[PDB]
């Protein structure tokens, strides 16, 4: 009910406020975690708050001194906010070099935002090789120190294991939410789903775990509802703008599954078990699949999406293409082919954080909704 949605709303609509509250109520520091994958468990074990950074709606101005026009929208946003000081409340940020744009932002950041420590981390492409895992562990030990240099105290092996446990409980709770939202596709409008998931980037996971468990309870008490409109699966970097979410709702489209980097990709793979804490984290990266940023010559992403569509009788797949995102742009043709090959219709919509005249998506989505009608 409003009770839970209210709390989540207040933290997503005002990320900075919550960071301030947390710091004063705990006397601990907060670290920003850049797009896609970061070892939050290390930040969490330290007692600090892992704060997800996924840009936002903003025009570009100060970013023009470091980036030309063709840098992806989301990273253009992160840099703008950075130069505007919107992240000054953080004691540091982890900018994983997952692609060229993230790599370049990390280099410019070291110069454009000297006051906010940049912690380097480059996940291995050969994530399945034992050597890949040992290398990632070293990167992680490096990440550990930097975080220790910031909070002051040492991060205990026992605490990390403890944090890994908190997060895995969070992931399975989230996956549980996915099935419950799916059973209640008319109650959980696209904007609701997004809010329930995104709010996890702005509060301690254990705290978010309880909120979602409650919501899941209220939802179970409700009868299983058959979707009145068309169901779809969203895939891409993100699709959190109220704009896009409204369009789906206006066309009575229900989102029952996603392959978004800001959402389901964050919790569909748990951290494996093991005696060595950093080793456990490193091996999760070995187990990630169906992601444009995770090395896979087989490009299983297309097939995995197909499986999700069939599992939930989804009517269509919508590619939420982040503007100028090359990793995703390379993936499009093949991932699209796998899906359409399996009888599933697809739609291409562009995600631009700098635009405020979204009309192309409206007409494309309206046409898609009408198309699925037959």
């Amino acid at each position: 009910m409003e009770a839970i949605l209210s709390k989540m709303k207040e933290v997503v609509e005002n990320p900075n406020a919550a960071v301030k509250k947390y710091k004063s109520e705990t006397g601990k520091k907060a670290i920003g975690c850049f797009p896609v994958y970061c070892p939050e468990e290390i930040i969490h074990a330290a007692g600090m708050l892992p704060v997800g950074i996924w840009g936002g709606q903003t025009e570009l101005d100060l970013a023009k001194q470091y980036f030309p026009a063709f840098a992806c929208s989301i990273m253009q946003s992160c840099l703008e906010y950075g130069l505007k000081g919107a992240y000054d409340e953080l004691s540091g940020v982890i900018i994983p070099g997952m692609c060229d744009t993230l790599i370049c932002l990390g280099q410019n950041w070291k110069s454009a935002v000297p006051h906010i420590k940049y912690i380097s981390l480059v996940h291995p492409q050969n994530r399945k090789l034992e050597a890949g895992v040992k290398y990632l562990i070293s990167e992680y030990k490096g990440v550990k120190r930097e975080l220790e240099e910031i909070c002051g105290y040492e991060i205990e092996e026992a605490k990390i294991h403890e944090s890994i446990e908190v997060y895995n409980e969070h992931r399975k709770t989230m996956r549980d939410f996915v099935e419950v939202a799916y059973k209640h596709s008319n109650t959980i409008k696209p904007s609701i789903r997004s809010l329930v998931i995104k709010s996890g980037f702005f509060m301690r996971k254990e705290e978010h775990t309880e909120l979602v468990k409650d919501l899941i309870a209220k939802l179970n008490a409700m009868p299983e509802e058959v979707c009145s409109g068309k169901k779809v699966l969203l895939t891409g970097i993100l699709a959190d703008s109220k704009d896009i979410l409204d369009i789906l709702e206006d066309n009575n489209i229900s989102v029952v599954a996603d392959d978004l980097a800001q959402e389901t990709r964050q919790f569909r793979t748990d951290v494996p078990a093991g005696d060595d804490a950093l080793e456990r984290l490193a091996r999760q990266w070995s187990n990630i699949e169906g992601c444009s940023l995770a090395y896979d010559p087989k490009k299983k992403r297309g097939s995995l999406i197909v499986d999700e569509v069939k599992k939930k009788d989804i009517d269509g797949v919508i590619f939420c293409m982040m503007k100028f995102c090359d990793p995703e742009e390379y993936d499009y043709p093949l991932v699209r082919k796998d899906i359409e090959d399996s009888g599933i219709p697809t739609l291409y919509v562009e995600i631009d954080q700098q635009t405020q005249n979204n009309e192309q998506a409206r007409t494309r989505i309206q046409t898609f909704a009408e198309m699925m009608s037959l």
Binding site: M98, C104, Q125
Partner: protein, 399 residues
């Protein structure tokens, strides 16, 4: 016997041998431009370079049709032109201007950028062929961490094991040693020969010639033929230095450093334009790109060499490469290419050009373009931009 003739025939011989191997049923691979070629050479494998093939097609004015083909398949114009051109070649089953056989295996190394990773995943999925990955994680620290070194050497090992299966041969430690020696020498001849411009005055060659010779150091770095090729070239360049001669038409009124790959679909036009203005490039970062030096049988050093290629080192070091190339080349200015294709190089150019100019005290200018997409370059624009730089240099020149 002329160097250019031997070079062009040596280059054209790589393609022919590739088609032959294909015909006889021997595996042909496609590889990134700065991959550890020593690993396949030791197996006598025929290896072709998509980046080289694409530059060649673009020069021959035929990269548009291929990019348009890749684009009609859903590939966004945002992606690097080399990849679009290559995807068009694959879909079209080759091309006429500069054709090459399909690959049976791939060699990918992200030291130049990460786009080749995705690009190669696609080819591998498309053709269902083995993909060998040598992942050199970006160096944020001034030096290569030991973790990176062990990781790279470990991949060198994975690569070798994969290639034994592919080539059907067993790794020969003795042969791998000779390729190392051969590769090491050619790496030396490349840095030396292509560095001569920093002296002479006039330079023994037109800066653009570098990009022609760049092809040999790229596709045949571990072959003895290249050694002789560069030896003949050197002899010709030194002969020119001692006679005040050069391939660069007219007087060399200005010395500059051009940052980035040239726009192959307009290489001709770019040559003429700069010449009429007495402008020549004698400062280059590329003599270092394929230097790749290490002691024989020293996997640690080889690892470091490939990881330190200038596209994979922090901004500070990238900046130093430029500043250094400007000075040593006795340059009067810096000309920057804002390449729409290469995001890695374009997304750090602003900060980088500011720093080099504030350290060298030299003036700079830039222009928009792309190395293979003729739609991103505007002639009229290139001319007024270089003319603008010329005005500044000539202005500071005469006190």
């Amino acid at each position: 016997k002329e160097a250019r003739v031997v070079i062009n025939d040596l280059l054209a011989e790589q393609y022919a041998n590739a088609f032959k191997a294909k015909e006889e049923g021997r595996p042909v691979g496609w590889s990134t431009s700065v991959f550890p070629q020593e690993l396949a050479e030791v197996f006598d494998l025929n290896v072709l370079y998509p980046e080289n093939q694409a530059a060649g097609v673009a020069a021959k004015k035929g990269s548009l049709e291929l990019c348009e083909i890749a684009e009609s398949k859903g590939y966004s114009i945002d992606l690097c032109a080399y990849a679009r051109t290559n995807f068009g070649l694959l879909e079209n089953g080759g091309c006429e201007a500069l054709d090459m056989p399909a690959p049976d295996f791939l060699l990918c190394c992200n030291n130049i950028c990460n786009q080749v990773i995705k690009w190669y995943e696609n080819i591998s999925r498309e053709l269902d062929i083995p993909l060998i990955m040598i992942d050199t994680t970006f160096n944020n620290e001034d030096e290569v961490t030991q973790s990176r070194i062990d990781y790279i050497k470990a991949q060198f090992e994975e690569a070798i094991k994969q290639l034994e299966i592919i080539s059907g041969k067993k790794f020969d430690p003795k042969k791998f040693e000779e390729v190392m020696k051969i590769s090491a020498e050619n790496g030396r001849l490349w840095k030396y020969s292509m560095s001569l411009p920093a002296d002479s005055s006039p330079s023994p060659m037109n800066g653009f010639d570098l990009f022609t010779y760049m092809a040999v150091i790229v596709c045949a770095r571990g072959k003895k033929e290249t050694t002789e090729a560069f030896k003949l070239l050197i002899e010709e360049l030194e002969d020119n230095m001692k006679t005040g001669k050069s391939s660069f038409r007219g007087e060399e009124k200005y010395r500059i450093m051009m940052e980035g790959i040239p726009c192959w679909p307009y290489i001709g036009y770019k040559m003429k334009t700069l010449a009429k203005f007495g402008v020549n490039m004698t400062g280059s970062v590329y003599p270092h790109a394929w230097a790749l030096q290490y002691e024989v049988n020293d996997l640690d050093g080889m690892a470091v060499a490939y990881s330190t290629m200038f596209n994979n080192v922090n901004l500070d070091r990238m900046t130093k490469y430029r500043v250094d190339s400007l000075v040593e080349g006795k340059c009067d200015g810096a000309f920057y290419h804002m390449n729409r294709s290469c995001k890695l190089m374009s997304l750090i150019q602003y900060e980088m050009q500011r720093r080099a100019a504030e350290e060298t005290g030299l003036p700079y200018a830039g222009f928009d373009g792309d190395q293979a997409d003729p739609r991103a370059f505007t002639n009229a624009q290139f001319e007024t931009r270089i003319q603008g730089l010329v005005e500044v240099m000539e202005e500071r020149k005469k006190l």
